[PDB]
Amino acid sequence: DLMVEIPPADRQPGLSLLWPVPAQPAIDKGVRQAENWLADQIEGQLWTAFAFGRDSLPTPMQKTAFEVAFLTRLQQRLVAAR
């Protein structure tokens, strides 16, 4: 039901999380933020996109959802150095 989904990307791609409360919008927010950083090549720090991005979520549960999606997204392209 209140499942959340991190869309597949390049390498190791996907997920099946039962999140404690509804949080798909927060997951997307985290994916988009990370790919917006990967895409637009380093013009600001990656830490900055993570920290300022997380701030914009209201709740600990949302913030944490943001983080999971952000780090997963990085994982995907990081692995992609096959």
Binding site: Q33, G44, Q45, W47, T48, A49, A51, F52, G53, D55, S56, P58, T59
Partner: protein
Amino acid sequence: ALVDGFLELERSSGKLEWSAILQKMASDLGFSKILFGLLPKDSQDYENAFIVGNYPAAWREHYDRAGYARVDPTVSHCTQSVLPIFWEPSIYQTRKQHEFFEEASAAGLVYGLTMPLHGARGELGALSLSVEAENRAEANRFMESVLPTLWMLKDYALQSGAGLAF
């Protein structure tokens, strides 16, 4: 020193002491000018937001009447992004922006940055600091080193500033 300023920020009783602490902390961080602006959720009445700081008086007066809030590249950035925006000449593209820039530069607001604010209760705002450095290289290097401390300032300021503006 900075940790103490954070606590004083949260302990602040009224707009006056808080805005005083905010300036005293900017000055300690080597930033001679700071502005904090914050609107309630879903408002764009820029000139009637909670606005504090020590921006040059002549300039603030001009900014309000001219309605520069709708020109300022940093202001529209704040409403569309979370990432901080350095004041690179490049953020000023259009004519009215190449012109907003000339005058802002005369007011002393040359080097610096704007951190967007997105409060938990959907509040919107901007935290800007300006630094007087020998050139842009030195300024951007400087601001990247202190950016983590500034992001925490942003955080204590947004949290304590919302329950005083509102």
